[PDB]
Design a binder for this molecule. Structure first.
Ligand SMILES: Nc1ncnc2c1ncn2[C@@H]1O[C@H](COP(=O)(O)OP(=O)(O)OP(=O)(O)O)[C@@H](O)[C@H]1O
Ligand SMILES: Nc1ncnc2c1ncn2[C@@H]1O[C@H](COP(=O)(O)OP(=O)(O)OP(=O)(O)O)[C@@H](O)[C@H]1O
Ligand SMILES: Nc1ncnc2c1ncn2[C@@H]1O[C@H](COP(=O)(O)OP(=O)(O)O)[C@@H](O)[C@H]1O
Ligand SMILES: [Mg+2]
Ligand SMILES: [Mg+2]
Ligand SMILES: [Mg+2]
Lengths: 85, 496, 314, 85, 110, 466
């Protein structure tokens, strides 16, 4: 509760300005939010925030929440990294 | 079938073992004996070693039974005969135990012969459930002014005695036992069970002498698993004693149990657990150390009329280190019991004895279950004595020098010797004296001398008045007021 | 009872196997065919007719197969007035080079603490003749006293005078258990007692103290059991001659350390600050033997070292 | 647990029995080796703390006498010691 | 766990499996295991011999070689059972039988 | 098929099956014990054997005893029939009111709601407690945690919350006693009868369902009672499409109980001796305690804190499952300030200006600002004292100390010890009151005037009584 998630969310929202500015050159930046061990409720708020802003169009959400098996939560980060690569 | 049978007679080894009811001991060491056989023994069943020593079936494994030895393992050897008893670990119980000193298994150690017990009881029974109980409403009078006024206890409650070593924890327990004679003579008894766990043998011997010489021993059971007894006996003592208390609890009677102390029981169990190679946690205690004490203190309860109206009250003792009430075991017990009486070295090292911190100490259910007359004076005492505790960092204007006036005097009223518990009626009288101003003219250094003189004066001149307060249990009635007025006026006159 | 053979030697831990009836735990075993007498205290019964022992001296040179004899009981040491003025070890051999300790009887160092009925319902002062003590912080007969303050504050002189004084005003003798004695300081303590008279090298009955050393260079098992040895010698004077005995334990901390080390070596999972899980019973099964019975009393003065100056340390 | 000296190669000589094959009294064969520790079969007569000799000429101290093996600490480079030495 | 029994079985059963393989046995050896496995399925006898703790290793050493067809076991068969017993693990008998039978199958095959 | 007991070690029992193996989570019935003993399959060990966890005492079990596969997981009664009844972990009545004749039985294990079914409703839940409403407000169907060390006030707080919320709730409530005091169960039961939320004569009119597995119960039972309770609440969440309250004192005991059996299931221990499955065990349970698009569950879970150490893995892992956190402090309680809520360690995912409004939002940040400033000073005051502070910091100290006391409040349920009538302050009255103090409008009022009162008007009145 110091504001860690908040920095990452706003960061994703921020790219909207540059996303679309392709030729003008200021390169696009696609976003990947990997959710590990969180509450599904938290991830839902998140996705609702991105959709409302129209940032979901350039974002991939990879979710392995608290009820998902340990090996799923272990893989999640590597899976999203591949999507990033 | 066909190519067989000839194998039997050529070997001729193992003529016929009886492995359903008997076993033999594969190995022993680190407190635990592993036994081959006992194929029909039950989990938690008592067994017998050829030395006559007892043990409990702890682990039922595919090829052996692990047994906890209630005795020194020195006395068991590979190959020894072990027999099942068919009984889950149990102990003798009943009134034939009162006045007697026993070990953890219920065996006499007082040299007055056999126990003569008619009933027996399983030691690790689960506590009564929600329905059979009801909120405590009967006082459990310690006879300690500090406790009975500001930290009042009730029958069926669990009240913790916590404090560093040499703060007077045991003494509170002893005075509480001696106190009960006043009531046990009447025709609402309170039977006592003092459980010694890890203490010095001499301490317990001196205890019994004191109980005997006061004629309090007649309604007290001493369960002793002192410092030299093997850990499993120290682990068991409290459960056994608890069973003995339950006998009264379930027959419309009341019993008091003191666990002196649970810190040492917990280290004994830790010893058993570590030798069993169970995974150590906080302070190396096993994950089930909380559960060890929860089972136990949950059996102390107040039963409703439909179950006889009997009760079992518990005074668990805990030893802290340098006043660390946030350590693992103390925090465990604080969350089990219904309140705490905190003792402080500082108060002790200054002469405030008993060393009770009235600021910290609490007792929820007990407050409502305290006598009317005490109720009429003790509320204000608590508040005032607290306010004085809030002020006294100064040790001014007008009323502030007055708070240090009452404060120091009231503080002197809370001091008390050992082996001299006071009837509720006496306690209200003395508390009334300080709260109403009748000490403000006295020198603080003389309040103890005054109080001692006042009490002997009341006992010898006004037994009837004391009797009426008791018998009637009343508030401070206008009648009792006028009577109190005369007693103190006359006494004050002869005192000065 | 029977003769066994060595199956394993791992430091101070030795496993012995017996073809006959196995020695009970705590029995003393005699390893045969060595330069010096080697004793093994039984610790566990492993099964397969094999026991696990802890060694009271060094184990270099032992061979698998070597024969071992069961003495039939725990470690036995000489007791009686012939011990006064002499220096002994865990297993009762003389370490003063003054020849055999020709006593009439020996006693086992392991023993049960006094029976409940045998306990003394009284609390009596053990007068010392020492003003500061008697007046302000009096010694209790059968009690334990914790002696704080190391060297240079007259510890050794206080010990010697308490000896002397108890002999004058009670006719009771003393016993020094040096648990983890530094050999240098053991030599000096010996000569300071001779110089002070509490020991007399001519009249051994005139000597007022029996010394028992567990030197620091001995293995953990010996350092763990020496206090018992010295305790057993003192029990003789209480029970057989009805006296009020003095039992010195320097230092009680090193008694706990030895125990910790022995427990570590037997593979037992350690507790709190790395102390043995049996910390409480190791200390308690010993200290409880120090008390006032109907016949007499053992009073104990114990040098106490406080790790990291932390009084809350286990 | 299995314990050392319960290996296919070692159990052959225990059951087969060649000529003057024994010599388990004054000689042994490495069962296992690593991190300056050699587990050795045989040497039934070797003493606790005895300095023994490897085929490379390297010295080693017998610190552990166990039921079916001797634990030897190596005074040299363990690269020069292998199974069966 | 029980899986631990296979570790020893694989070795103990291989030890003898090698002697017969190189020197000469496999063919006639198959019978020895077949007959041995047949006697092991005398429930009362088999259990008493293998699984229960009978204290004396000497008592169980000679008893083992005896209970077997004093006939259908080559030198190695007698040597193995004793040694196996001497180590306090003759109880792992089936664990090895199944292992040995497989060795033959490997030596045979396709 | 039928199976047989091969081993018994505490609550862990191994059972061999001659034929088909019962799957993980299946409930088995142990025969010939006198009383119904349920075993829950934990794992398949191999060799046709399974490890199970007993739901009651295993004393008296003997190797060879017969065990029956029920063909499904532990199932308990659910529906309107549970209201006013007291059940244990395996669905048996413990109120002496006879058998629970349910139309539905349901497994205590269940899938957590799916992502697409999640609800994102953000609406305040006003408690009437000043500290909570102002600084870290609760959320209607949100998850609330009450953290506290031994005897710091968790139970008092949850009971006050039942008194302030469950009273004035339209829907049904479920209380789950997990590893706590049985007599607290007796008090609660008789308290609810008194107030009429439970009725023994009209069991249909009862509004609360009780489930209890207290600290007298063995580990298996305590490890599962929370699932049992939450299963009853799941029915009311969906099968009626309503709002449900779920109260749990104390969910820590769920994790503690699991720690006890894990030591016997053969898991290699993790930090501080806890089960390595601590996080996932909690997760599979906690993720069912939630609002969906079908209905909402508002949960209030008391969380014990071993040795007052919030970094203990049990509590530390609980924070990740909460929408609001009320952290009780021993240092605060010892100052006499109740409830003992740490105003700077308590948070809410609802404290957002867009949700609570800018006034509410601004006043909270301001209160926490001055309290934090006071905190940073306290260290320097301990040695030198107050006279060494700047004429400005003297002022923040003054208001801060008044604010510390104004966060205190007498509870109805604590009357029994305090002797002070309980008070409920409306959120609007809380914001205003605290704004005025922050702005300095009562710098002329004495500290003592603010201690143990409700709204600011009570402060002034008290300042007059003096
Ligand atoms: N710059 C800011 N201004 C106002 N509020 C903020 C700011 N940053 C964060 N917050 C608030 O703080 C709260 C917690 O922040 P965040 O969502 O980052 O949690 P977190 O730090 O990741 O902790 P956890 O790991 O428990 O989720 C949010 O509800 C958010 O509204
Ligand atoms: N709001 C309050 N006002 C006054 N006193 C309180 C308040 N809350 C708690 N107390 C006091 O503090 C003590 C702790 O009460 P409580 O039963 O809540 O402990 P707890 O920490 O919740 O126990 P558990 O671990 O079982 O949840 C009681 O003795 C009570 O008198
Ligand atoms: N009311 C009292 N007045 C004077 N001394 C007391 C009182 N209560 C206890 N003591 C003293 O406290 C010391 C230790 O008492 P004890 O009850 O054994 O405490 P603990 O059980 O904590 O060791 C004793 O020496 C005793 O004299
Ligand atoms: Mg976050
Ligand atoms: Mg005591
Ligand atoms: Mg609670």
């Amino acid at each position: 509760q110091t504001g860690k998630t908040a920095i990452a969310l706003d960061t994703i929202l921020n790219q909207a300005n540059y996303n679309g500015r392709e030729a003008d050159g200021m390169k696009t930046l696609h976003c990947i939010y990997v959710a590990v061990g969180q509450k599904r409720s938290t991830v839902a708020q998140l996705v609702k925030k991105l959709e409302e802003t129209g940032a979901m169009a350039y974002t991939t959400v990879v979710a392995a929440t608290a009820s998902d098996p340990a090996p799923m939560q272990y893989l999640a980060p590597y899976s999203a990294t591949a999507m990033g690569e | 079938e066909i190519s067989a049978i000839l194998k039997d007679q050529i070997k001729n080894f193992g003529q016929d073992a009886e492995v359903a009811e008997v076993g033999q001991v594969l190995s022993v060491g680190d407190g635990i004996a592993r036994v081959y056989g006992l194929d029909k023994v039950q989990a938690g069943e008592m067994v017998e070693f050829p030395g006559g020593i007892r043990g409990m079936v702890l682990n039922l494994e595919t090829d052996n039974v692990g047994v906890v030895i209630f005795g020194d393992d020195r006395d068991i050897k590979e190959g020894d005969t072990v027999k099942r008893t068919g009984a889950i670990v149990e102990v003798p119980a009943g009134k034939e135990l009162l006045g007697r000193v026993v070990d953890a298994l219920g065996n006499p150690i007082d040299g007055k012969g056999p126990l003569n017990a008619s009933e027996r009881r399983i030691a690790d029974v689960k506590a009564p459930g929600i329905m059979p109980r009801k909120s405590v409403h009967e006082p459990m009078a310690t006879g300690l002014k500090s406790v009975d006024a500001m930290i009042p206890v009730g029958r069926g409650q669990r009240e913790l005695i916590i404090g560093d070593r040499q703060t007077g924890k045991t003494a509170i327990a002893l005075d509480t036992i001696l106190n009960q004679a006043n009531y046990n003579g009447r025709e609402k008894t309170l039977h006592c069970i003092y459980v010694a766990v890890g203490q010095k043998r001499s301490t317990v011997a001196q205890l019994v002498k004191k109980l005997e010489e006061t004629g309090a021993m007649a309604y007290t059971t001493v369960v002793a698993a002192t410092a030299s007894d093997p850990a499993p006996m120290q682990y068991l003592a409290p459960y056994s004693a608890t069973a003995m208390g339950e006998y009264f609890r379930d027959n419309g009677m009341d019993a008091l149990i003191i666990y002196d102390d649970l810190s040492k029981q917990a280290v004994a169990y830790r010893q058993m657990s570590l030798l069993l190679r169970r995974p150590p946690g906080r302070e190396a205690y096993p994950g089930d150390v909380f559960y060890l004490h929860s089972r136990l203190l949950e059996r102390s309860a107040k039963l409703n009329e439909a179950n006889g109206a009997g009760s079992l009250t518990a005074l668990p003792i805990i030893e802290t280190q340098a006043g660390d009430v946030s350590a693992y075991i103390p925090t465990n017990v604080i969350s089990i019991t219904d309140g705490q009486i905190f003792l402080e070295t500082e108060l002790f090292f200054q002469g405030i004895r008993p060393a009770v911190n009235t600021g910290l100490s609490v007792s929820r259910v007990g407050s409502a279950a305290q006598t009317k007359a005490m109720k009429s004076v003790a509320g204000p005492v608590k508040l005032e004595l607290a306010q004085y505790r809030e002020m006294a960092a100064f040790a001014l204007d007008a009323a502030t020098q007055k708070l240090l006036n009452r404060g120091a005097r009231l503080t002197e009223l809370m001091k008390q010797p050992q082996y001299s518990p006071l009837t509720n009626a006496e306690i209200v009288i003395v508390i009334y004296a300080g709260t109403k101003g009748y000490l403000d003219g006295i020198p603080v250094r003389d309040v103890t001398k005054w109080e001692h003189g006042l009490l002997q004066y009341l006992r010898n001149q006004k037994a009837d008045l004391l009797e009426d307060m008791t018998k009637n249990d009343r508030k401070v009635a206008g009648e009792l007021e006028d009577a109190i007025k005369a007693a103190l006026d006359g006494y004050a006159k002869t005192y000065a | 009872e029977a003769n066994g053979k060595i199956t394993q030697v791992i430091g101070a831990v030795v496993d012995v196997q017996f073809d006959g009836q196995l020695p009970a735990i705590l029995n003393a075993l005699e390893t045969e065919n060595n330069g010096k007498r080697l004793v093994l205290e039984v610790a566990q019964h492993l099964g397969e007719n094999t026991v696990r022992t802890i060694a009271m001296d060094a184990t270099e040179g032992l061979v698998r197969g070597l024969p071992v004899k069961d003495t039939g009981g725990p470690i036995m040491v000489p007791v009686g007035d012939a011990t006064l003025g002499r220096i002994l070890n865990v297993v009762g051999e003389p370490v003063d080079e003054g020849g055999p300790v020709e006593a009439t009887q020996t006693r086992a160092i392991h023993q049960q603490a006094p029976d409940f009925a045998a306990q003394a319902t009284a609390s009596e002062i053990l007068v010392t003749g020492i003003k500061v003590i008697d007046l302000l912080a009096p010694y209790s007969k059968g009690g334990k006293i914790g002696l704080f303050g190391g060297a240079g504050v007259g510890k050794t002189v206080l010990i010697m005078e308490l000896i002397n004084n108890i002999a004058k005003v009670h006719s009771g003798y003393s016993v020094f258990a040096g648990v983890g004695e530094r050999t240098r300081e053991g030599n000096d303590l010996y000569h300071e007692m001779v110089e002070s008279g509490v020991i007399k090298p001519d009249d051994l009955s005139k000597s007022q103290v029996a010394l028992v050393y567990g030197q620091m260079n001995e293995p953990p098992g010996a350092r763990m059991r020496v206090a018992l040895t010295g305790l057993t010698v003192a029990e003789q004077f209480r029970d057989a001659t009805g006296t009020d005995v003095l039992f010195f334990v320097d230092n009680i901390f090193r008694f706990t350390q030895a125990g910790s080390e022995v427990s570590a070596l037997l593979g037992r999972i350690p507790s709190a600050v790395g102390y043995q899980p049996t910390l409480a019973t190791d200390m308690g099964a010993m200290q409880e033997r120090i008390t006032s019975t109907k016949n007499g009393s053992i009073t104990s003065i114990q040098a106490v070292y406080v790790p990291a100056d932390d009084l809350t340390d286990p | 647990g299995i314990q050392a000296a319960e290996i296919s190669a070692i159990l052959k000589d225990q059951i087969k029995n060649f000529g003057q094959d024994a010599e388990v009294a004054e000689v042994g064969q490495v069962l296992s080796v690593g991190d300056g520790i050699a587990r050795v079969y045989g040497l039934d007569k070797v003493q606790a703390g005895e300095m023994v000799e490897f085929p490379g000429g390297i010295r080693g101290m017998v610190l552990n006498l166990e039921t079916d093996n001797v634990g030897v600490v190596i005074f040299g480079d363990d690269r020069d010691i292998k199974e069966g030495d | 766990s029980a899986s631990i029994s296979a570790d020893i079985a694989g070795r103990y059963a291989q030890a003898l499996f090698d002697l017969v393989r190189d020197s000469g046995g496999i063919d006639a050896l198959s019978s020895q295991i077949d007959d041995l496995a047949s006697a092991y399925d005398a429930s009362q006898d088999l259990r008493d011999l293998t699984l229960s703790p009978l204290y004396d290793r000497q008592q169980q050493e000679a008893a083992v070689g005896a209970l077997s067809e004093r006939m259908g076991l080559s030198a190695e068969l007698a040597n193995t059972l004793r040694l196996l017993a001497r180590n306090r693990r003759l109880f792992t008998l089936p664990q090895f039988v199944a292992k040995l039978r497989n060795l033959i199958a490997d030596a045979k095959g396709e | 098929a039928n199976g047989k007991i091969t081993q018994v070690i505490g609550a862990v029992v191994d059972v061999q099956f001659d034929g088909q193996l019962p799957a993980i989570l299946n409930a088995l019935e142990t025969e010939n014990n006198g009383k119904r003993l349920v075993l829950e399959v934990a794992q398949h060990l191999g060799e046709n054997t399974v490890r199970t966890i007993a739901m009651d005492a295993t004393e008296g079990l003997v190797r060879g005893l017969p065990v029956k596969d029920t063909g499904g997981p532990i199932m308990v009664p659910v529906g309107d029939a549970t209201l006013g009844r007291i059940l244990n972990v395996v669905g048996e009545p413990v109120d002496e009111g006879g058998p629970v004749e349910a139309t539905q039985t349901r497994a205590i294990h269940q899938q957590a709601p799916d992502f697409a079914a999640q609800a994102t409703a953000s609406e305040i839940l006003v408690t009437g407690i000043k500290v909570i409403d102002l600084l870290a407000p609760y959320s209607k169907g949100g998850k609330i945690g009450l953290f506290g060390g031994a005897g710091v006030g968790k139970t008092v707080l949850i009971m006050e919350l039942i008194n302030n919320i469950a009273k004035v709730h339209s829907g049904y409530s479920v209380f789950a006693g997990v590893g706590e005091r049985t007599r607290e169960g007796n008090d609660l039961y008789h308290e609810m009868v008194e107030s009429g939320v439970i009725k023994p004569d009209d069991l249909s009119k009862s509004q609360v369902a009780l489930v209890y597995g207290q600290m007298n119960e063995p580990p298996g039972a305590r490890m599962r009672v929370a699932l049992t309770g939450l299963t009853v609440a799941e029915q009311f969440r969906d099968a009626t499409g309503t709002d449900v309250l779920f109260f749990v004192d104390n969910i820590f005991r769920f994790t503690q109980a699991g720690s006890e059996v894990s030591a016997l299931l053969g898991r290699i221990p993790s930090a501080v001796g806890y089960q390595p499955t601590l996080a996932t065990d909690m997760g599979a349970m906690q993720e069912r305690i939630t609002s969906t698009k079908n209905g909402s569950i508002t949960s209030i879970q008391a969380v014990y804190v071993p040795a007052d150490d919030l970094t203990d893995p049990a509590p530390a892992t609980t924070f990740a499952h909460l929408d609001a956190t009320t952290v009780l402090s021993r240092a605060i309680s010892e100052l006499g300030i109740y409830p003992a809520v740490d105003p700077l360690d308590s948070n809410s995912r609802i404290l957002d200006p867009a949700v609570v409004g800018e006034e509410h939002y601004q006043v909270a940040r301001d209160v926490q600002g001055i309290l934090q400033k006071y905190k940073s000073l306290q260290d320097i005051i301990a040695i030198l004292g107050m006279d060494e502070l700047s004429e400005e910091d003297k002022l923040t100290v003054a208001r801060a100390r008044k604010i510390q006391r104004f966060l205190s409040q007498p509870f109805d349920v604590a009357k029994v010890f305090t002797g002070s009538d309980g008070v409920q302050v409306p959120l609007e009255d809380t914001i205003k009151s605290f704004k005025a103090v922050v702005a300095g409008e009562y710098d002329h009022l004495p500290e003592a005037a603010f201690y143990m009162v409700g709204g600011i008007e009570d402060v002034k009145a008290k300042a007059q009584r003096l």
